[PDB]
Design a protein around this ligand. Structure first.
Ligand SMILES: Nc1ncnc2c1ncn2[C@@H]1O[C@H](COP(=O)(O)OP(=O)(O)O)[C@@H](O)[C@H]1O
Ligand SMILES: Nc1ncnc2c1ncn2[C@@H]1O[C@H](COP(=O)(O)OP(=O)(O)O)[C@@H](O)[C@H]1O
Ligand code: BEF
Ligand code: BEF
Ligand SMILES: [Mg+2]
Ligand SMILES: [Mg+2]
Lengths: 752, 131, 752, 131
């Protein structure tokens, strides 16, 4: 922070509610100890701007316009939040450029408009080129991972992050498409076509229209693309995470169930689907709740054709496909099963109830048996078992639990069979893994779902922060500058609060095994253990049923309500046993051959084990507005998203470290003019050291490396300022002499 | 001597030279002030007064004496090798764009004949010529 | 060659006798088909300059002054002979910079003044730095060879070339000094001190004052510095070539014998040298012929002290040193032996002849026996042997042959014993070889000595030309541009004329074994075989006793006189047998335990076998004036020397090839302004291709690579010209509009 | 209309405007020639005649008609992205250093108020303003 740069005419950035930052210009020199700055704005003429004492900081300096809007940020004079925001905004709005490099990451801003930059011609253009010779593009990241795989003889990962609607799935699919083209045909087995065909299958069963995205992924996916020893694709393997089971039975206004249900209902009139007895999407309780049966521009019947074609390509026989559709239609009919209450603790299904009759035909089970176990529960004390009736409300909730359980197991069966079709008989030589999973999320009401997502994000952030640190440490070590000068962000204390013994998840599991355990007793256990004893844990001031975690991106308040029930994820065993015992429907029993939190902890650990043994490549997607508008950018939302993916903190760290790095030759050549002839030695490095120690007295501001000088922020700018001063003063001395001479000559002429 | 100078710059008859001509006269008599140094002693006026107001030799004498109380180091700054030479093209550029900017014609007048065939000026001899 | 660049004000270079080239400026545009150019010079105002038709070429364009005098030539607009000459001259005279990179070579121009750039501080400064981050220096070449050795896991060589007095030996010693400092102590054996101590020993016995150099090397040296597996020096091994034996017995005016003889004579009064019965240097026939007993600034007595100290460091005992000095003093006394003629075919040594008496005491042989065989020869027909007297003239020549033979064998003995002292018991892991040998030479009279030197130079030039070609071929292959577009200079036809069957050397050996063989019959054999049948062989128009070889650097006329005698190098066996039979002087017989041309061919083959299996690094030394004047430069002599080391041809080749190389991104960014909006595709590479084919119609002028466009000379300059034209015209269109608007506003104001 | 213009530029009384003023008049009447185009029709004289010789409205009419027998493409050349904007600082630099050089004041007059806060000029609207 160099006060000498804050001279008259110097442009700064100051706070502004609507655009986060706004430009201002100094109308007078800052003198040390000044309490304010004199500034001219764009609108409203002048302003007296108060500088807060104690934390005595001046506003960020604006980069010269000429340096703004490049493909990366490496040539900026000043690196800070306003500079990043401004460079991204200018590239996006003024030039319709959605891709930009920011340090080691590719930033991708969703245009909500089709751009002509993804054709086979462009894939070929990026193939065999250096990233630095090409404009930023998702294809450049894929190409660099492909090349690094062979060059380092190490496996790679592409990690794509962002809010819902930001462009993660689009980016991940373009990366896969790139790999399929440039490293194709390991054989005549059409491997690449098969890997690509997994996309429409997974999107039909795992994506849904939400308010934020018409094609929202309601699961996380890691796909490991396998290569042989000549770096040709030989197949893939997929893992999935955090499937949103609740969507099967509930939708908020304007939202749909999973796409496949609407593909099926739109195909209700197909002869092959006669026995499914399907109505349209408004006929079923499980698809009608949002009041949004159709998505603008999507033809669900035509998508069904595409889904079936993909299934056939991946070796799912016609009869297994029909089985999948029988089970999906069964789930829909199950949702239309109605209960009539008898009293406060008992219910019944009406005689000859068509939805149950159809469900039982489709599932190959007996109406009598299913009806009974939809309206009764089997309990079990230590000594004996017994059967009790249940209330209509409890029957409804148990019925929905069954529907969710069926769907989740069908989903897993399809993933498994996709993996079988994409499996290589010869073990892969290497791989590139592509991860497309929920970004950090927080809403007014946060529950178990958000908690698991934000936990995954702390782990992924930790990998990112440690990767950046290792790269930085290597730069300092090569220059023999102490690597202990490097700062980094530590996610481990948050992670410990979540996953260690006595942490949030461990306490949840312990409360779940207590008969009298509840959301309320769990909340008190959290407080007893962590309140006032972990700086990252807080209790809301007006609630005894919620807790706050300080995550990397923000504080998040979670409501305890439903945490135990969601962790347990109970389904009535007797209902499942009926389906399992289906006698002549082969697929159904195949679906049913630890708490949710414990299973998620284990699966996340296995993902990180895989990812930590790769070299990661990061793509940070940004959703620039909340309404799917073409090329429309909101600064506040953009900055929020740059915080939520760790970019603002990375930039802060880099800027506060030693961002300027000059060879001694570069330094001597530029700043020789600042040196007295007496100080110039034959040893140029020794000269630079001697001179710099006199020009900048504070030794905190630079470090002498083996080949380079490292400078903190503002130091090169200061040297540029005093260099310009030196040149200006020397020039004025020559000018005044020449003006004198010119006038002496003119005066001799008029004399004569 | 100073009187014979002041009279030659009066182009009207009022016994007074214009305000904008005051610098020109001090330089004619052997002084080498900067434009800002002469604009200090002459009140630092706006574009109205510079081309209007007038002063006499009696009220101009305390300005000539005010200004009347090395140059080689200025040139040595643009000598990138320390070898006694500066590039005339670099010197033309900085004299017309930095500091108190001179016109293309003014610089072309003083520099003509002093550039060698590699575009260099031996600045010790150039400095003695302009003094 | 782009005529469009030859516009008014454009600076060119044209021929000039005194400075090779002189600057000129166009006073008018060149129009195609013009027979002359209109030029202004520095002196003599204007000129009409005739352009030769048939070979229609315009004069080389001058680089802008701002680009002149950099550390290498990579940023020049125009590459040609005048540009290289001018860049070297400006750096040397204006800035006192002696080192400059020219392509892959370091050029080193002898300042004949001590410069403060060789101290230990500077050695440390170059250690661990990239060549591109440092100013050119001999230390940078040594550092790059040291690093390449480890990085490529290959042995390296430093080849230093130039005329006598150019700086070869100074450069080679600084390279060795560099290695000794940065890779020292493999043990307490003081290895580096010993390697360095070989220098004063070899210079005392192998260097002499000539008219061109006070410290001329009269032998070539290859020294292989050995390193262990941690790249520490463990010793060295030295090979020598082409020792000038004739200097032992003859010196031209102003020249001395080998330094050691003057070191010895200057020490004549030392008690330990009493038995050597030495006079001063003017007393002996073999040291007095030049009339130059003393070298300005050299104290021969003090140099003797240094020579003895070095010998002791390398393990030569006091008694072996005394033996060396006994043999050297013996050679001097032998030279003072006088013969009295008896008749035209017989001579005798006078009774009690002191020089012979002293020689025989020093050598431990009998006066009677030596006297007899100095004045008689033993001949041998097939059947029997007999003894004949010899003339005074033949006795004198045989005596000198003996003196030369003694010295050459003493020299070899010292080299062998230096090698024993520098030998490592553990085989080296790797090596860096340093070669310091005679550059290409031609005088008014050239003989066998020059022929051998120029032969060695064709072989060394061939290595250089092939190294440059291989590097170039690799650049073209990476870009998928046909490497058959590359030119190179082929030394092999010259080499074949010299060394192949029926070639010059083979014919010389064949003539030498014929009893009636002579210089005259050999000359006729050369003509019979090669005249009109080898384009590189010519006969002088007025001589039947000489031949001309077209070498890489120039045509060289060799006189046949003495070739057979020099090839045979005969010494009377009976004289040698007397020395060999010395009974109580141990060293002398140790000295005597194929033609010269055949032995040289073999030793040169062995040198090239070694060098061809290394990566070579080239230093081209230039002697800038012929009088040892501080910082004084002659253009004609400089250009001559740049030709004689192959640099001008390398530069010609590079310039006539494809010297400009731009990425498609660089091209698009710079020349987008030359493109119609309709031609700009998403595929930027395809855009550049389409546009360039329209802007430059001649497809000979560029090639499209994988990542870069390669351009012939002048093409980027042409594009820069039409780019500037485009910007100028657009700017004028805007200017005229603004001038119109400004005047319309002024006219409305005066109206009102 | 053309007569009312020619008379206003005569600052003496001889019924004639100076030779150097001929370009200024053609531009006042709505024409947009370059300095070289006006110096073609006016004989291409030296610095002597430009500040001396004089011509009448009768001998000036065949020059005004000679000159009287797109601009958007000029601006589009300095648009490095093709995005409808040019940098005002680049435009100031090229207008004052390339071609028929304009002074700092002339460019500052026409450009004032047309630069946005990122230093850009929307040149379609700027071009219509200067026509
Ligand atoms: N690069 C892009 N080009 C055009 N539209 C895009 C692009 N990226 C995202 N979109 C639009 O945004 C929608 C949501 O993107 P998506 O990748 O599904 O978001 P995420 O997986 O992050 O939730 C897409 O269906 C598409 O309409
Ligand atoms: N770099 C140098 N600095 C100072 N003097 C030099 C330098 N190089 C050469 N010389 C001078 O030139 C002389 C001849 O150089 P030398 O290396 O012996 O030439 P070469 O071996 O090519 O015949 C040296 O003895 C020294 O006087
Ligand atoms: F809705 Be996106 F798949 F996060
Ligand atoms: F005289 Be140098 F050693 F070639
Ligand atoms: Mg998605
Ligand atoms: Mg030598």
């Amino acid at each position: 922070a160099a006060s000498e740069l804050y001279t008259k005419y110097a442009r700064v950035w100051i706070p502004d509610p609507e655009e986060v930052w706004k430009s201002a210009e100094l109308l007078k020199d800052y003198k040390p100890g000044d309490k304010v700055l004199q500034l001219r704005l764009e609108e409203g003429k002048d302003l007296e701007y108060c500088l807060d004492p104690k934390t005595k900081e001046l506003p960020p300096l604006r980069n010269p316009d000429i340096l703004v809007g490049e493909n990366d940020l490496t040539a900026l004079s000043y690196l800070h939040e306003p500079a990043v925001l401004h460079n991204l905004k200018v590239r996006f709005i003024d030039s319709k450029l959605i891709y930009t490099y920011c340090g080691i990451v590719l930033v991708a801003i969703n245009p909500y408009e089709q751009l002509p930059i993804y054709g086979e011609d462009i894939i070929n253009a990026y193939s065999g080129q250096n990233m630095g010779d090409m404009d930023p593009h998702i294809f450049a990241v894929a190409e660099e991972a492909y090349k690094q795989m062979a060059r380092d003889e190490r496996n790679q990962s592409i990690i794509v992050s962002g809010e819902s609607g930001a462009g993660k799935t689009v980016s991940a699919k373009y990366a896969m498409r790139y790999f399929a083209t440039v490293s194709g045909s390991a054989s005549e087995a059409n491997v690449e076509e098969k890997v690509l065909a997994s996309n429409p299958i997974m999107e039909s069963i795992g994506n849904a229209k939400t308010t934020r995205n018409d094609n929202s992924s309601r699961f996380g996916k890691y796909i490991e693309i396998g290569f042989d020893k000549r770096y040709r694709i030989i197949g893939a393997n997929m893992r999935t995470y955090l499937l949103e089971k609740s969507r099967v039975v509930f939708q908020a206004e304007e939202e749909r169930n999973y796409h496949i249900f609407y593909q099926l209902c739109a195909s209700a009139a197909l002869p092959e689907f006669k026995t499914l007895r399907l109505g349209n999407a408004n006929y079923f309780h499980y698809t009608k709740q949002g009041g949004s049966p159709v998505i603008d521009g999507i033809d669900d019947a035509k998508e069904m054709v595409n889904t079936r074609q993909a299934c056939t390509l991946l070796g799912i026989s016609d009869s297994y496909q029909m089985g999948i559709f029988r089970i999906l239609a069964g789930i829909l009919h199950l949702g239309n099963v109605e209960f009539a209450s008898r009293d406060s603790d008992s219910c019944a299904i009406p005689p000859k109830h068509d939805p149950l009759t159809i469900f039982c035909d489709l599932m190959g089970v007996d109406y009598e048996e299913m009806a009974h176990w939809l309206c009764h529960r089997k309990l079990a004390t230590a000594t004996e078992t017994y059967i009790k009736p249940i209330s209509k409300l409890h029957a409804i909730n148990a019925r929905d639990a069954l529907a969710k359980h069926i769907y989740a197991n069908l989903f897993n069966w399809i993933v498994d069979h996709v993996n079988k079709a994409l499996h290589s008989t010869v073990k892969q030589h290497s791989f590139i893994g592509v991860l497309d999973i929920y970004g950090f999320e927080t809403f007014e009401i946060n529950s178990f779902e958000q908690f698991c997502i934000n936990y995954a994000n702390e782990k992924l952030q930790q990998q990112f922060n440690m990767h950046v640190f290792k790269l930085e440490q290597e730069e300092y070590m090569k220059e023999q500058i102490p690597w202990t000068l490097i700062d980094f962000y530590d996610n481990q204390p948050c992670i410990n609060l979540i996953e260690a013994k006595m942490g949030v998840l461990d306490l949840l599991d312990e409360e779940c095994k207590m008969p009298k355990g509840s959301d309320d007793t769990w909340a008190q256990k959290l407080y007893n253990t962590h309140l006032n004893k972990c700086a990252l844990f807080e209790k809301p001031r007006l609630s005894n049923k919620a807790f706050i975690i300080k995550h990397f991106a923000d504080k998040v308040e979670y409501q305890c309500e439903g945490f135990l029930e969601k962790n347990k994820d109970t389904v009535y065993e007797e209902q499942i046993k009926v389906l399992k015992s289906s006698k002549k429907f082969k697929l159904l029993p195949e679906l049913f051959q630890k708490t949710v939190g414990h299973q998620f902890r284990n699966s996340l650990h296995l993902l990180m084990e895989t990812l930590n043994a790769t070299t990661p490549h990061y793509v940070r997607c940004i959703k620039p507005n909340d309404f799917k508008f073409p090329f429309t950018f909101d600064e506040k939302r953009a900055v929020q998203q740059l915080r939520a993916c760790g970019v603002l903190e990375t930039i802060r760290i880099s800027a506060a470290g030693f961002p300027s790095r000059w060879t001694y030759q570069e330094f001597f050549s530029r700043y020789r003019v600042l040196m007295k002839q007496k100080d110039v030695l034959s040893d140029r490095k020794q000269t630079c050291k001697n001179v710099l120690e006199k020009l900048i007295l504070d030794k905190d501001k630079y470090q002498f490396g083996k080949t380079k000088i490292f400078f903190r922020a503002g130091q090169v700018a200061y040297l540029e300022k005093i260099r310009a001063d030196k040149l200006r003063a020397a020039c004025i001395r020559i000018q005044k002499t020449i003006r004198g001479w010119l006038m002496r000559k003119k005066y001799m002429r008029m004399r004569r | 001597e100073f009187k014979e100078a002041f009279e030659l710059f009066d182009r009207v008859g009022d016994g007074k030279i214009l305000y904008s001509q005051c610098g020109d006269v001090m330089r004619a008599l052997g002084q080498n002030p900067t434009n800002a140094e002469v604009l200090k002693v002459l009140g630092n006026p706006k574009s109205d007064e510079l081309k209007s107001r007038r002063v006499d030799f009696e009220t101009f004498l305390p300005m000539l004496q005010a200004v009347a109380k090395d140059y080689l180091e200025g040139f040595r700054v643009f000598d990138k090798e320390g070898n006694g030479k500066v590039m005339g093209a670099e010197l033309r550029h900085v004299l017309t764009t930095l500091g108190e900017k001179m016109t293309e014609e003014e610089v072309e007048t003083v520099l003509a004949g002093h550039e060698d065939s590699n575009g260099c000026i031996n600045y010790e001899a150039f400095l003695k010529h302009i003094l």
